[PDB]
């Protein structure tokens, strides 16, 4: 379990890198309309489409 935990640390970074691509551009701009929850939220975009969106952990 000790060596395992160290192993798992390396996985977190690998994973962080992979996700990062998805995370960047194409990125549309909304306004933060309201919060349904603190895991999914509602944001309203600038072509008028309102969206049901997931919150990606890389912010608070």
């Amino acid at each position: 379990i000790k060596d395992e935990q160290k192993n798992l640390k390396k996985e977190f970074l690998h994973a962080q890198e992979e996700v990062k691509r998805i995370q960047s551009i194409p990125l549309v701009i909304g306004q933060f309309l309201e919060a349904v929850d603190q895991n999914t939220a509602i944001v309203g975009s600038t072509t008028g489409s309102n969206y049901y969106v997931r919150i990606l952990s890389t912010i608070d």
Binding site: I25, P26, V28, I29, S45, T46, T47
Partner: protein
């Protein structure tokens, strides 16, 4: 001559008619807010082969459509309406509308 022209033409054919935009606010080099001409305002990046001073707000810039990143600097632009207005002037008189006045 035709070889060079067609090879350059294939590169035009795979390449789309990328979104034109304007810089609403430059927060930093890596995050620029743009007003795209399709409608929705986007967060775009920049390539490092550009100077950020040129790209600053109120200036037209090219945007990508493949990635949503600022492609390059475009000089400020004026409408075709303004061209009709800039062209016209002739039928003039030398100096005076009426002499002695």
């Amino acid at each position: 001559k035709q070889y060079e022209k067609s090879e350059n033409d294939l590169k035009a054919l795979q390449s789309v008619g990328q979104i034109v935009g304007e810089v609403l606010k430059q927060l930093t080099e890596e995050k620029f807010i743009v007003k795209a001409t399709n409608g929705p305002r986007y967060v775009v990046g920049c390539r490092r082969q550009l100077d950020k001073s040129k790209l600053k707000p109120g200036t037209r810039v090219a945007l990508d459509m493949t990635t949503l990143t600022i492609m390059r600097y475009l000089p400020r632009e004026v409408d075709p309406l303004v061209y009709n207005m800039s062209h016209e002037d002739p039928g003039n008189v030398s100096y005076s509308e009426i002499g002695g006045l």
